[PDB]
A paper describes a structure:
The redox-responding transcription factor PpsR (photopigment suppression) from Rhodobacter sphaeroides is such a multi-PAS domain-containing protein. PpsR possesses three PAS domains (designated N-domain, PAS1 and PAS2) and a highly conserved glutamine-rich linker (Q-linker) as well as a C-terminal helix–turn–helix (HTH) DNA-binding motif. PpsR acts as a repressor of photosynthesis and tetrapyrrole-biosynthesis gene expression by binding to palindromic DNA sequences (TGTc-N10-gACA) present in the promoter region of PpsR-regulated genes. Additionally, the function of PpsR is regulated in a blue-light- and oxygen-dependent manner by the antirepressor AppA that, together with PpsR and its cognate DNA, is able to form a light-sensitive ternary AppA–PpsR2–DNA complex.
We finally extended the phases to 1.65 Å resolution using a native data set and refined a high-resolution structure for this variant. The PpsRQ-PAS1 structure revealed a typical PAS fold consisting of a five-stranded antiparallel β-sheet flanked by several helices. In addition to the PAS1 core, part of the Q-­linker adopts an α-helical conformation corresponding to a PAS N-cap. This is important for dimer formation as observed for other N-cap-containing PAS domains. The main dimerization interface is formed by the N-cap, its connecting loop to the PAS core (residues 156–161) and β51. The N-cap further contributes to PpsRQ-PAS1 dimer formation by protecting hydrophobic patches on the PAS core of the symmetry-related molecule, as also reported for a subset of other PAS proteins. The 20 N-­terminal residues are disordered and could not be modelled into the electron-density map. The remaining ordered part of the Q-linker region (residues 143–157) forms a helical element that corresponds to a classical PAS N-cap. As proposed previously, the N-domain also significantly contributes to PpsR oligomer formation and/or integrity, most likely by stabilizing the extended Q-linker helix as shown by the disordered N-terminal Q-linker part of the PpsRQ-PAS1 structure. In contrast to the other studied PpsR variants, PpsRQ-PAS1 exists predominantly as a monomer at the concentrations used in this experiment.
Residue numbers in the entry:
A (entry chain A), B (entry chain A): 143 to 257
Write the structure that this text describes.
Amino acid sequence: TQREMETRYRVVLDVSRDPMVLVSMSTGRIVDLNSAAGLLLGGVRQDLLGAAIAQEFEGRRRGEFMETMTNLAATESAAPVEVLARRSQKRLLVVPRVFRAAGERLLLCQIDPAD
Amino acid sequence: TQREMETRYRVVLDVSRDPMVLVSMSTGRIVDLNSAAGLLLGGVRQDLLGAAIAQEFEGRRRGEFMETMTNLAATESAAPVEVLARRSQKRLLVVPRVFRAAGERLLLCQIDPAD
């Protein structure tokens, strides 16, 4: 059940063509992502896991960026933040949604190209 | 951990814009899906959960259809089956991938419009 649902989660995230990054509300760090997100961000999973999400985006810092996404996720309008990914040099639209798991909050962020 | 990973799975599947249906290899029935899949199939989650996947598609039967998807998933080429969804009357492309969880196999099927 632990491993069962873990396995379902892993496969659905990996197979999904929707570019997604999962971010810790506590630390602002990337806790998971899929390869579609990796492609838009310009990095492999191994480089992005554990990385501060704000530092992937030019001119952003953890405090303000996490506050921005937290506030946007509260509008429940799928409102996006416009960003520029340092590695890929692609302008992107990031749409955050907050949910609770294991006593903490995570932000599931969808990524789309902006241009 | 059971609930934690279950919660992650639920949210990722629901939020993902990639239309996905999860099918039991054992029964050929739909065990899960997201609303993007529901839209293409022409049914709500409540009508589709527990339904035989083959019976959603005109002219298909469980035996041959499950054998078709199982064989296609083995080619590892993302080869699609062309189908016509009874409820929505949309021609679709279904791409199956097989994985193991909790001692059984599931097919995670991506759905795309065909026309």
